[PDB]
Coordinates of C-alpha atoms and ligand atoms in Angstrom, one line a residue:
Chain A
X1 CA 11.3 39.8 -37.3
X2 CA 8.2 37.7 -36.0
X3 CA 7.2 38.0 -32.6
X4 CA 5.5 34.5 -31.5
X5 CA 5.5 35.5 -27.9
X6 CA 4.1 38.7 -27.9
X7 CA 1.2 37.3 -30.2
X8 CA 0.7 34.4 -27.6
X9 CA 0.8 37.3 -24.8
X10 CA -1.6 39.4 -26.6
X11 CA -4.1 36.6 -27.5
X12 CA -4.2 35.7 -23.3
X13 CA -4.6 39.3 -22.7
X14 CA -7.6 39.3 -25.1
X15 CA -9.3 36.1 -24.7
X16 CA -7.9 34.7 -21.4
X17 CA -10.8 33.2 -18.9
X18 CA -10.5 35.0 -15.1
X19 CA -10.1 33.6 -12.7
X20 CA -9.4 34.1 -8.7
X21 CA -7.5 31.6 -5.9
X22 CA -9.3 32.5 -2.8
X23 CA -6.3 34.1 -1.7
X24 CA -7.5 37.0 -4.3
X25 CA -4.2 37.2 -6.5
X26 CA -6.0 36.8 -9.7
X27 CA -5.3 35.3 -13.5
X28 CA -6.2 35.6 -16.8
X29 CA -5.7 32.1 -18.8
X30 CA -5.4 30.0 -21.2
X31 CA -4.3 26.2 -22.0
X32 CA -2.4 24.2 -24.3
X33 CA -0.9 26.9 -26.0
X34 CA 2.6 26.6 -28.3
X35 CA 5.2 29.0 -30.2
X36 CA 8.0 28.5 -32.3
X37 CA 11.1 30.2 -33.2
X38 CA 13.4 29.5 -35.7
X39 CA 17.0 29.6 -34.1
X40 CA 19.2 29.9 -37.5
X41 CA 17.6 33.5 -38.1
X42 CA 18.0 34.9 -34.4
X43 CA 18.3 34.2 -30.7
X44 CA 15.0 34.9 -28.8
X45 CA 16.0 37.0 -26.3
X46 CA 12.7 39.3 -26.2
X47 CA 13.6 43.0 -27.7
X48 CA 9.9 44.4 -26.5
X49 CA 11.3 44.4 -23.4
X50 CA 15.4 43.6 -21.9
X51 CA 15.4 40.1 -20.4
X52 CA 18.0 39.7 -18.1
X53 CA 20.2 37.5 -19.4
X54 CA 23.0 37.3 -16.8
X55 CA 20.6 35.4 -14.5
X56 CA 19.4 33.2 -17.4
X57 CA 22.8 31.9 -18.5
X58 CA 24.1 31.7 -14.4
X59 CA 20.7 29.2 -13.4
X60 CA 21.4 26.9 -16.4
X61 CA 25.0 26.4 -16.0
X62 CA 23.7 25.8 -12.6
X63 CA 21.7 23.0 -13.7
X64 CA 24.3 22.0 -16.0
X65 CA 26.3 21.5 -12.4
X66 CA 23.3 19.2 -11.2
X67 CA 23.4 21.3 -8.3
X68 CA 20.9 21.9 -5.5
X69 CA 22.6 24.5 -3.1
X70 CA 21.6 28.8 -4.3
X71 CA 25.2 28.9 -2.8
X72 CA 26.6 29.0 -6.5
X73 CA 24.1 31.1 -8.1
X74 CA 24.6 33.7 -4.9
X75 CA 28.2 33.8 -5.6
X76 CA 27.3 35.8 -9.2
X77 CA 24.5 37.6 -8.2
X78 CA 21.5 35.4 -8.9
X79 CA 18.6 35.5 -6.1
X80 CA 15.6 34.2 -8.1
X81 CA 15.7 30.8 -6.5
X82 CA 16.3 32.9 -3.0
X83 CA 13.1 32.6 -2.0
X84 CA 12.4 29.0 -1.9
X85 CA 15.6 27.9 -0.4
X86 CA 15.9 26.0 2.9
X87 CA 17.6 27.8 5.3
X88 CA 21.2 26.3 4.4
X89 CA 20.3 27.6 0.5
X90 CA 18.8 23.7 -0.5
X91 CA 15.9 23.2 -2.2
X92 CA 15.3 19.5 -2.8
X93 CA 16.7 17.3 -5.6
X94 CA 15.1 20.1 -8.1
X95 CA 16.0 20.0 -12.0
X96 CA 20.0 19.6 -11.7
X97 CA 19.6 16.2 -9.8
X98 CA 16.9 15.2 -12.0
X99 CA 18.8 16.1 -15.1
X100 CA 22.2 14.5 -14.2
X101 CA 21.3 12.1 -11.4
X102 CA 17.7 10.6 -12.0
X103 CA 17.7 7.3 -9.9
X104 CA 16.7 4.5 -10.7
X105 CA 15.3 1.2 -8.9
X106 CA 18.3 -0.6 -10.1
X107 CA 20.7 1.5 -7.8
X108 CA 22.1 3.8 -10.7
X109 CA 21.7 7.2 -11.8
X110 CA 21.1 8.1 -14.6
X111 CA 23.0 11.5 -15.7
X112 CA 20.0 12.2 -18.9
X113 CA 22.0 15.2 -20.3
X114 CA 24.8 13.3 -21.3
X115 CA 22.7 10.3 -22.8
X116 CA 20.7 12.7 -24.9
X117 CA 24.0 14.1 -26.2
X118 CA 25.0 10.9 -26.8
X119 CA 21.8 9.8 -29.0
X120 CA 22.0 13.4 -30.8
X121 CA 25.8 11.9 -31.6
X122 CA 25.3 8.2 -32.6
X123 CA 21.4 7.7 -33.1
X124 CA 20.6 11.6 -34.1
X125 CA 16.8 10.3 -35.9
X126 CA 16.1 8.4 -32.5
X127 CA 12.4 9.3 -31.1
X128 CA 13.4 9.4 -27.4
X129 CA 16.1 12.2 -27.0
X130 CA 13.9 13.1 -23.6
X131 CA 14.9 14.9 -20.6
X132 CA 12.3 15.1 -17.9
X133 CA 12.2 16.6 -14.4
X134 CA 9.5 15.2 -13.7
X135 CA 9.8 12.6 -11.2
X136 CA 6.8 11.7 -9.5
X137 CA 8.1 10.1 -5.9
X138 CA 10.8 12.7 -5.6
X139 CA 8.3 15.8 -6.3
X140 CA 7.5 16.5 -2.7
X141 CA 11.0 17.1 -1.6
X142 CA 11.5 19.4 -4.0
X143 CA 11.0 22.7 -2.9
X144 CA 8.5 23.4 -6.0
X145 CA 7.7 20.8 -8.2
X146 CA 9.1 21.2 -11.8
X147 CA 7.9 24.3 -14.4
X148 CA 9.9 23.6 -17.3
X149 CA 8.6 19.6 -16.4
X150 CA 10.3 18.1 -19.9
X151 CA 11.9 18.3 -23.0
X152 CA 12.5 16.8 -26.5
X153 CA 15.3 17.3 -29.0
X154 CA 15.1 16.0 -32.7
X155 CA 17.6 16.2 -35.6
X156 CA 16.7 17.0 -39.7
X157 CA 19.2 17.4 -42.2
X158 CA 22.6 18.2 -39.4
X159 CA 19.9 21.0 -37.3
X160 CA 18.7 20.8 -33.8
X161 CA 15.5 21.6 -32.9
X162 CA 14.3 21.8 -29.0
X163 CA 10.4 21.6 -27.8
X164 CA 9.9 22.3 -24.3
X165 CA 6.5 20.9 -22.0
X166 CA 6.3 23.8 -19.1
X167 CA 3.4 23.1 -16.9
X168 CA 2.7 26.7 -15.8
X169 CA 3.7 29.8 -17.3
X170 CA 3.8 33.0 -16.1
X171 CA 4.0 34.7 -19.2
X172 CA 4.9 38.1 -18.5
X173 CA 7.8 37.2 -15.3
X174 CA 8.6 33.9 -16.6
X175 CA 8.2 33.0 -20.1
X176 CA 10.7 35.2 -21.5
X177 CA 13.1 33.9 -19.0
X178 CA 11.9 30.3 -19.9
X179 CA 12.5 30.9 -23.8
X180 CA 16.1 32.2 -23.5
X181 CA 17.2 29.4 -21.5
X182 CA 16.4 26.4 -23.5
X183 CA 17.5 28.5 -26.6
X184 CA 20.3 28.8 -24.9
X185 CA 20.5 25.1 -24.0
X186 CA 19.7 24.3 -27.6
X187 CA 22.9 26.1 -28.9
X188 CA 25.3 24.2 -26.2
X189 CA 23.7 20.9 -27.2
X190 CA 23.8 21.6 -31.0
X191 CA 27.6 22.7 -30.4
X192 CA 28.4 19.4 -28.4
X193 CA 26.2 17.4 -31.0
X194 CA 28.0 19.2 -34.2
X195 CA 24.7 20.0 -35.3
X196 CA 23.5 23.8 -36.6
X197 CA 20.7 25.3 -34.6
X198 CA 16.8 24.6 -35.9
X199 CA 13.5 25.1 -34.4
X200 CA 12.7 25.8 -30.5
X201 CA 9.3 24.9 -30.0
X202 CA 7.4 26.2 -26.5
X203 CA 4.5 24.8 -25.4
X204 CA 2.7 25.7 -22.3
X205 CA 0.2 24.1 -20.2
X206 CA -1.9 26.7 -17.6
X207 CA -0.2 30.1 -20.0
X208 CA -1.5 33.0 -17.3
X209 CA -1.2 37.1 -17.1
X210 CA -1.5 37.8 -13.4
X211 CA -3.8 40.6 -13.4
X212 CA -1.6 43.0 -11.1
X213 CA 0.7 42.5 -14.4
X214 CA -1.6 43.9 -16.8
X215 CA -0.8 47.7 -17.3
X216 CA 3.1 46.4 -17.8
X217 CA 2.0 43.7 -20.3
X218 CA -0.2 46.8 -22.3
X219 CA 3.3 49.0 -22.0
X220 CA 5.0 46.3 -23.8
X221 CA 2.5 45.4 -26.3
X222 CA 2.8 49.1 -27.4
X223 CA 6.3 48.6 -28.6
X224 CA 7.7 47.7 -31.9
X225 CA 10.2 44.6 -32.1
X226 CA 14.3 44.7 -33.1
X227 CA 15.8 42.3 -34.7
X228 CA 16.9 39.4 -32.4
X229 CA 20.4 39.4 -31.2
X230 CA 22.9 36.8 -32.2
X231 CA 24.1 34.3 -30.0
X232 CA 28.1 32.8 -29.7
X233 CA 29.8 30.3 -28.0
X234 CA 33.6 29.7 -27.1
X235 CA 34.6 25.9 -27.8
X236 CA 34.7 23.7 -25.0
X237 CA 35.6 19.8 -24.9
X238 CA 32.0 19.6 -22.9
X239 CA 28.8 21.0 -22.4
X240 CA 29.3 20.9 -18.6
X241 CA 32.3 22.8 -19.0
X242 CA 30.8 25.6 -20.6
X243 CA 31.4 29.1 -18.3
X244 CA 29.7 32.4 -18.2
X245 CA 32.3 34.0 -20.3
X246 CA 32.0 31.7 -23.1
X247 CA 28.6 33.0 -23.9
X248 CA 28.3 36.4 -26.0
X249 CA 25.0 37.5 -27.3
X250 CA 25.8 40.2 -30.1
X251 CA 23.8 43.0 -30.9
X252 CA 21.0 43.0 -28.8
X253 CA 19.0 46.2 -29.1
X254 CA 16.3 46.0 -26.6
X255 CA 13.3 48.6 -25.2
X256 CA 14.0 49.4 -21.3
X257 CA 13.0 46.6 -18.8
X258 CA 9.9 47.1 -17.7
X259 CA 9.4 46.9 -13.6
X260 CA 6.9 44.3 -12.5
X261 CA 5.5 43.6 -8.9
Chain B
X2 CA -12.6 21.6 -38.5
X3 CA -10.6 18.6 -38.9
X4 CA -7.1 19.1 -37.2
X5 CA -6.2 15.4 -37.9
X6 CA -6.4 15.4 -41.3
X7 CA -4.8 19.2 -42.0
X8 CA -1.9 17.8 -40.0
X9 CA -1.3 14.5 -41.8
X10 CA -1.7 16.6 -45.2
X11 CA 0.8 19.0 -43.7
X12 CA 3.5 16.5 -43.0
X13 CA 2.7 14.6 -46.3
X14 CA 3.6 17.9 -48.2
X15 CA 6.2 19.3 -46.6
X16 CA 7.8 16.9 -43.9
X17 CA 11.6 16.1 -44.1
X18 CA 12.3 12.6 -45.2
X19 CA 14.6 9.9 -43.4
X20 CA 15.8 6.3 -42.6
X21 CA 16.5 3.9 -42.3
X25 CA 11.8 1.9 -42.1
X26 CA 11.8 5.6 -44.1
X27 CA 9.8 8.3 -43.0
X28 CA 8.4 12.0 -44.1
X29 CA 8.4 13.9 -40.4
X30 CA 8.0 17.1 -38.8
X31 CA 8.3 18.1 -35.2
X32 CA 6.5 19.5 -32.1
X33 CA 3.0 20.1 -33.8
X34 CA -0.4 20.6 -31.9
X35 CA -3.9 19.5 -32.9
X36 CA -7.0 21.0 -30.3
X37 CA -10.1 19.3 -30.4
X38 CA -13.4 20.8 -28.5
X39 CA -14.9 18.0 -26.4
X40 CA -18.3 19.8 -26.1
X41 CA -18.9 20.0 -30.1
X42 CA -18.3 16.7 -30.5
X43 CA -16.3 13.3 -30.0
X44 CA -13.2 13.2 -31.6
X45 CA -13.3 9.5 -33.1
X46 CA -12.3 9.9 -37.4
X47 CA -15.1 9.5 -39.7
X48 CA -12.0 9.5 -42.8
X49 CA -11.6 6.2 -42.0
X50 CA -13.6 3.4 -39.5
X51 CA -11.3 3.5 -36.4
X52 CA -11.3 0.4 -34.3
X53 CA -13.0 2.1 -31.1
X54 CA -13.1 -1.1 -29.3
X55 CA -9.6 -1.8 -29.3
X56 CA -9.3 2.0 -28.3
X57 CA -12.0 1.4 -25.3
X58 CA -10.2 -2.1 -24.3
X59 CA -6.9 -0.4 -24.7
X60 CA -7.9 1.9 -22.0
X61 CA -10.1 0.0 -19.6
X62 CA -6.4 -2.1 -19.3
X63 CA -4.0 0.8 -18.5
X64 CA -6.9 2.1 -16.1
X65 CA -6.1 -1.3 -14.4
X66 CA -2.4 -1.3 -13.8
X67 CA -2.0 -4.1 -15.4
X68 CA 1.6 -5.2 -17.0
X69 CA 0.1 -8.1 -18.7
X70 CA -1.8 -8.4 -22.2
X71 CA -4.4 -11.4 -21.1
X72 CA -7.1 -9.7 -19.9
X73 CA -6.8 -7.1 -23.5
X74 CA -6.0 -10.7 -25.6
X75 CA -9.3 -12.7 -23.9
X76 CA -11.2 -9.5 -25.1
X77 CA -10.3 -10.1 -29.2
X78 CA -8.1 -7.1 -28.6
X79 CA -4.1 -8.0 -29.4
X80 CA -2.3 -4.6 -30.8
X81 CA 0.1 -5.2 -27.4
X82 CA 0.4 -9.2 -28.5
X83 CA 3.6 -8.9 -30.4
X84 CA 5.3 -7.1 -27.9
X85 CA 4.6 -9.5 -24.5
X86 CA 7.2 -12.0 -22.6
X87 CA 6.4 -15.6 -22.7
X88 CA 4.0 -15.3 -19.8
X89 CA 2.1 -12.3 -21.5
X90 CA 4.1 -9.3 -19.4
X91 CA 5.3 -6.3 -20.8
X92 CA 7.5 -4.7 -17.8
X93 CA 6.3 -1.2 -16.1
X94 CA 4.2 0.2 -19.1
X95 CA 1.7 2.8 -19.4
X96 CA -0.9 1.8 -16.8
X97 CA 1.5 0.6 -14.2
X98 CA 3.1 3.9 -13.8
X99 CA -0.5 5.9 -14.1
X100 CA -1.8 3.5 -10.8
X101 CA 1.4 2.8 -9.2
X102 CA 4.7 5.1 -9.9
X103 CA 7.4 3.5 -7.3
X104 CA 8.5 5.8 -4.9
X105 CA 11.8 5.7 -3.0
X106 CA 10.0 5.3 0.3
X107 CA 8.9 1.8 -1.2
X108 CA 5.6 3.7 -1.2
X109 CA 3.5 3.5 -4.9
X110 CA 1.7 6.1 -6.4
X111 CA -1.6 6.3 -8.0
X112 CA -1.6 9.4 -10.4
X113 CA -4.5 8.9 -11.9
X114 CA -6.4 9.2 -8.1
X115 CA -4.2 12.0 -7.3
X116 CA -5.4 13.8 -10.6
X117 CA -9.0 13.0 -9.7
X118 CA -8.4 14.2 -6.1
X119 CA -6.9 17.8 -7.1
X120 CA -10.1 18.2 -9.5
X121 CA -12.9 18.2 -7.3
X122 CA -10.6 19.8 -4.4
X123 CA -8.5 22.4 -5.9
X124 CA -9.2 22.4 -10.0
X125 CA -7.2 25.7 -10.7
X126 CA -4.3 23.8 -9.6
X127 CA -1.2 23.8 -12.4
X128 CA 0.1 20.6 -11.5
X129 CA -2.5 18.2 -12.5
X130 CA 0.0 15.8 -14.2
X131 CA 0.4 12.3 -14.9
X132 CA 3.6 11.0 -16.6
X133 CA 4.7 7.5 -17.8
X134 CA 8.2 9.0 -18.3
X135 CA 9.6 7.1 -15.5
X136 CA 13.4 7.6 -16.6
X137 CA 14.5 4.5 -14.2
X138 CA 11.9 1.9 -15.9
X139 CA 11.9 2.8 -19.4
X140 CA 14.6 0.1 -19.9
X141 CA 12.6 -2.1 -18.3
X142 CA 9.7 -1.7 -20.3
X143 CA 8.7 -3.7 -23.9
X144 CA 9.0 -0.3 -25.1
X145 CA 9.4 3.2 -24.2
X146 CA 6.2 5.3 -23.6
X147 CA 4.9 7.0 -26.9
X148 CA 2.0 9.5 -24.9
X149 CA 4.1 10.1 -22.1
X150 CA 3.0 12.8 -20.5
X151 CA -0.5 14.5 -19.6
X152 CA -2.0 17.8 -18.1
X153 CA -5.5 19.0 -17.2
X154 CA -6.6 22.3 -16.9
X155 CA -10.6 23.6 -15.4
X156 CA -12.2 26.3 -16.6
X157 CA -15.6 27.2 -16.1
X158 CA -16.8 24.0 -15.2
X159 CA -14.7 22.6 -18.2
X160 CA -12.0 20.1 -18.3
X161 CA -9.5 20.3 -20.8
X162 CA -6.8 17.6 -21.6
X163 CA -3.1 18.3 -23.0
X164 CA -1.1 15.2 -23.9
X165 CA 2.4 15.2 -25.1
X166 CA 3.0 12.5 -27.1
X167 CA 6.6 12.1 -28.0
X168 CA 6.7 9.9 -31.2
X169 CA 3.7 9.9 -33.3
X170 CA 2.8 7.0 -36.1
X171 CA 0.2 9.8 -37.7
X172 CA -1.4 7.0 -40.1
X173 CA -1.9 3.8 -37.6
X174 CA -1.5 5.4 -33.7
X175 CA -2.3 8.8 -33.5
X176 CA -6.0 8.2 -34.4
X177 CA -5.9 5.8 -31.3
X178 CA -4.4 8.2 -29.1
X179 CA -6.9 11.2 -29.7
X180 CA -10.0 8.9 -29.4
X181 CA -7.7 7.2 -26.2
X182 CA -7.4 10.5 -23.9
X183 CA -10.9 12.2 -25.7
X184 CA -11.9 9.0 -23.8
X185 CA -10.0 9.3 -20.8
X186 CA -10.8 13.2 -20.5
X187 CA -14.9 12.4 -20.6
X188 CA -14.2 9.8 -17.3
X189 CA -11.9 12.3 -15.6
X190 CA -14.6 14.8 -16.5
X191 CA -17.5 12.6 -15.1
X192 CA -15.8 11.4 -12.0
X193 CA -14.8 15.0 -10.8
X194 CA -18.5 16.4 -12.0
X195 CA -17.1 18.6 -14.6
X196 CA -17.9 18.7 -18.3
X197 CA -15.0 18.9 -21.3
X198 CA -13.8 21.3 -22.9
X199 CA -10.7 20.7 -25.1
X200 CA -8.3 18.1 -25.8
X201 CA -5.1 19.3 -26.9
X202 CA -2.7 17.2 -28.8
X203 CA 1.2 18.1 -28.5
X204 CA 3.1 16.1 -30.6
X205 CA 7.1 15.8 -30.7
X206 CA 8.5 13.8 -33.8
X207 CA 5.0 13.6 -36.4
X208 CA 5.8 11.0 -38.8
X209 CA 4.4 9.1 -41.7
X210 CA 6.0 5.6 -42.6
X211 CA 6.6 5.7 -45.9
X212 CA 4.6 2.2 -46.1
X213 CA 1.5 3.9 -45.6
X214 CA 1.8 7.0 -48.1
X215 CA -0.9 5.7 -50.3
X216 CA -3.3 4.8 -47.6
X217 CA -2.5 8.3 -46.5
X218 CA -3.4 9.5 -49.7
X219 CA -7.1 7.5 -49.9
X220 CA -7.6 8.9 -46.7
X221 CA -7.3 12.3 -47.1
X222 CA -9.5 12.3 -50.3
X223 CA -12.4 12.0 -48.3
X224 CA -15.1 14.3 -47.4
X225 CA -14.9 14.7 -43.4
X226 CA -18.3 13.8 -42.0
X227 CA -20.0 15.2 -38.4
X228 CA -18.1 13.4 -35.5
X229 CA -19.8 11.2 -33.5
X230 CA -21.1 11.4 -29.5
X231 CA -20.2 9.8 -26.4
X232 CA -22.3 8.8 -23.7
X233 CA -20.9 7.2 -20.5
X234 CA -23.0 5.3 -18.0
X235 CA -23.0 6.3 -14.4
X236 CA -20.4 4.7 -12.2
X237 CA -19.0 5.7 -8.5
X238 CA -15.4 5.2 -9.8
X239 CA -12.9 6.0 -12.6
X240 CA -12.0 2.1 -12.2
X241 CA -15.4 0.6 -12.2
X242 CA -16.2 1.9 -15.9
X243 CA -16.6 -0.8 -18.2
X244 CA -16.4 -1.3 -21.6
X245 CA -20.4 -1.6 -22.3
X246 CA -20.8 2.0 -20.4
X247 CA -19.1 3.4 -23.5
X248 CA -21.7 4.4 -26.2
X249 CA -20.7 6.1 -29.2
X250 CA -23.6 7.5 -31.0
X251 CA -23.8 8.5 -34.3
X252 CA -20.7 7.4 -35.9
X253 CA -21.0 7.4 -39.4
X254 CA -17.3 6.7 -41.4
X255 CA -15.7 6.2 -44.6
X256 CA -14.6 2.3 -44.7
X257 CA -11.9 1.2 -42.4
X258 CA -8.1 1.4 -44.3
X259 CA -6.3 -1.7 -43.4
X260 CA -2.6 -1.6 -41.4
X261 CA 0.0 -2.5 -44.6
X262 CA 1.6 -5.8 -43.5
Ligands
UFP1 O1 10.5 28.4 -14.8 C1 9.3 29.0 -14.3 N1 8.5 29.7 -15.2 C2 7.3 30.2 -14.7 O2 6.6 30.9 -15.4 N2 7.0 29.9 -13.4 C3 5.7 30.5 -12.9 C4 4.4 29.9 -13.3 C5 3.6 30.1 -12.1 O3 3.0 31.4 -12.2 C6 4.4 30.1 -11.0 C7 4.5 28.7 -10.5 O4 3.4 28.4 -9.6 P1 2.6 27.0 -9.7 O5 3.5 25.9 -9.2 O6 1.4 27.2 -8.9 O7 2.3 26.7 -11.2 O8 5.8 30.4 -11.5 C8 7.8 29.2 -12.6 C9 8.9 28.7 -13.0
UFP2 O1 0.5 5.1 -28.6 C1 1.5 5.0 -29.6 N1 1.3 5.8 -30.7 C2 2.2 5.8 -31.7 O2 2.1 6.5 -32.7 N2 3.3 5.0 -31.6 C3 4.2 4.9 -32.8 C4 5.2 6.0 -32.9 C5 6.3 5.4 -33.6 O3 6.1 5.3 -35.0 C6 6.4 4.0 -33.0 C7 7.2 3.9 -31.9 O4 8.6 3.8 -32.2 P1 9.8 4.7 -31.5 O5 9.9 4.3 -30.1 O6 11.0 4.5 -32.3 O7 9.4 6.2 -31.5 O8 5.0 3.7 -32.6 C8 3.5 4.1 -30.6 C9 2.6 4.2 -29.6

């Protein structure tokens, strides 16, 4: 179909300002940049390119858990959050506290997933279906401060639709990892919800190419789209108790992964 | 190039309609506006700058209470104060003074100014009002909730999200509010603007203001206005008469349906 990420990719490639962090690393950049897909004609699992999708689903029902400890995501193969781990495998009351466990001054804590699902339920035209990660006195502890910072759902005629504020965005590593997450997300919640699926919206704040990423971005605008695979769901009685196996993605036709330092 | 306008059209035409006030809406749209070219404030319609200025000058204090906005002829907050004028942890209280768990208070809006003039390619130039644990505490919860800058060249560009937009009556406030904000931000750290980017999340006309929708987008748009601000040592010593706008030149003001 339409490919709104490799347009945004392209259009950074092209007219992204340079620039350099002392270090030497190096950037290509824009700001304040969005894309849309429309989730009733496909899921947005890039085709240019396979996205690992394993490792997407794993970190999200990881979230999903609220928890803090690599330990779970270790257990099926996920090392992406290796790095940053303490040396026990913690890394600081990161998105899963945030999302099901924000406190508050009052003593509680608030778990933000299940309130949003129960707006989507009772008050689906409410203007405040937020989730953030975002919080400001707990930012240090964390052992980066939030990417995917905070999102928005909003309901029109029975469909969901999802718009995500990420901060930073490494478009070529991250972004397609980014987009098939809160896709994903959108499908669970529009399942819980019993909505259909409608619009994911992406907007980016600092949208970057790092320059030693350059000659695989070129490779991958050189290649011709599929048609986005479709995306299923076993029932479950809760979002949180959605597992690995209850997610299929059908028909997914992708170009080779491409290899990136 | 009028993003303002194109977008209130857009949602006009083709948003979805709702209740129950009633409402045509769309969701997560983005206007860009270029600093450099020009001051953002409508010409479509005579915006009330002052209360936008006022408005500003107020959250920049920290302030949870409307007197020092009411004793300056300035009452868009009235309706929503306590008995003693407070409003709970809004807007400029968490900008100045976020609580922290270690009893601690944060001042994003120095924090912002601290990572532009030390390290400006820094990605996490944020403030946010989204303060899950207060919102309930608050007259209301945050509309422009969350805001990014970016440097580039020299250039500072602004990206607010704003999750709940009143396209007729607040979004006009909003993009003259943090075009505003950016130019002081700008100043302070010695940079000069570049863009502001509006992100909006649920873009809605009331359906009581469809016709003054209408009257305002059959008019010409004119050359936007400029700002000038007077020198100051500090983001929080600006007043309101260092704000110039020069040249400003709209179509009559469109009076708020009652
Ligand atoms: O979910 C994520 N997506 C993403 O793209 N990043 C990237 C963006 C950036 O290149 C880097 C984060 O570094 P910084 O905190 O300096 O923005 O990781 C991180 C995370
Ligand atoms: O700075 C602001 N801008 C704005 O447009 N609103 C509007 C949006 C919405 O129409 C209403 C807030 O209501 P709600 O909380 O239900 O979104 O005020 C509020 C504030």
């Amino acid at each position: 179909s339409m490919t709104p990420y490799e347009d945004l990719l392209r259009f950074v490639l092209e007219t992204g300002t340079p620039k350099s962090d002392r270090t030497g690393t190096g950037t290509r950049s824009l700001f304040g940049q969005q894309m849309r897909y429309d989730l009733s004609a496909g899921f947005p699992l890039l085709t240019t390119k396979k996205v690992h999708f394993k490792s997407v689903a794993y970190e999200l029902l990881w979230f999903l858990r609220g928890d803090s400890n690599i330990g779970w995501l270790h257990e099926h193969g996920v090392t992406i959050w290796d790095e940053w781990a303490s040396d026990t495998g913690e890394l600081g009351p990161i998105y899963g506290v945030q999302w099901r466990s924000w406190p508050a001054p009052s003593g509680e804590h608030i778990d933000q997933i299940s309130a949003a699902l129960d707006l989507l339920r009772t008050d689906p035209d409410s203007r405040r279906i937020i989730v953030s990660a975002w919080n400001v006195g707990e930012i240090e502890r964390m052992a980066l401060p939030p990417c995917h910072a905070f999102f928005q759902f909003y309901v029109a005629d029975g469909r969901l639709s999802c718009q995500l504020y990420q901060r930073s965005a490494d478009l070529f590593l991250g972004v397609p990892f980014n987009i098939a997450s809160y896709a994903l997300l959108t499908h669970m919640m529009a399942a819980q919800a019993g909505l259909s699926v409608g619009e994911f919206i992406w907007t980016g704040g600092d949208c970057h190419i790092y320059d030693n990423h350059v000659e695989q971005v070129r490779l991958q605008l050189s290649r011709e789209p599929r048609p986005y695979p479709k995306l299923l769901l076993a029932d479950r009685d809760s979002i949180f108790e959605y597992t690995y196996e209850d997610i299929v993605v059908k028909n997914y036709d992708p170009h080779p992964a491409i290899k990136a330092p």
